[PDB]
Design a protein around this ligand. Structure first.
Ligand SMILES: *CCCC(=O)c1cccnc1
Length: 108
DNA sequence: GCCATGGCTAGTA
DNA sequence: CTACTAGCCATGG
């Protein structure tokens, strides 16, 4: 599997998340058959044009939260996009935007 | 090669 | 609950 391949598969996968459902770096990395690739699942998302028509927002972390970004908190997008999707999120005690994984969670 | 860097994760404590 | 740890692994200097 070339990376250019990984990347698309992932994309396809991530594109199979329904409105208002989410999934998780890890899972999608499993789903496409690369269980050790959660990081790289992220790298894929990070690597997308803002114009993209791909539900990049529907992919948080297995700890049930939205991942912090050393590409600065512009990810606040994620929260919002999710809020529009219809997703109850709350702040913790470092805001760590958080949602009920079991509730909102994709399961083919 | 080394090293440092990430939208990660599972296991401890 | 949080707060560290291994491990993980492509990527870019
Ligand atoms: C992985 C998605 C990042 C991205 O393209 C984006 C961030 C903020 C606003 N629009 C797009």
């Amino acid at each position: 599997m070339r990376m250019d391949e990984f990347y698309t598969k992932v994309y396809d996968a991530v594109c199979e998340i329904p409105y208002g459902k989410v999934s998780t770096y890890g899972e999608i990395a499993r789903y496409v058959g690369m269980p050790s690739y959660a990081r790289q699942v992220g790298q894929a998302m990070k690597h997308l044009h803002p114009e993209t028509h791909v539900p990049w927002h529907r992919v948080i972390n297995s700890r049930g939260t939205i991942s912090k970004r050393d590409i600065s908190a512009g990810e606040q997008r994620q929260k919002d996009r999710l809020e529009e999707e219809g997703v109850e999120i709350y702040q913790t005690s470092l805001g760590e935007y958080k949602l009920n994984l079991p509730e909102y969670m994709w399961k083919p």
